[PDB]
Design a protein around this ligand. Structure first.
Ligand code: B74
Lengths: 19, 19
């Protein structure tokens, strides 16, 4: 599910940015 | 939130494996 991964990556990527 | 990212990465990583 590449699409699911992409969405999750955003959350993980965004979460990392937040701290 | 590195910890949040790690958890999300697993979901994204696992999701990718599923397809
Ligand atoms: C979007 C993403 C890139 C590299 C590693 C993770 C877990 C997520």
């Amino acid at each position: 599910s590449p699409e699911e991964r992409a969405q999750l990556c955003t959350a993980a990527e965004k979460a990392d940015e937040l701290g």
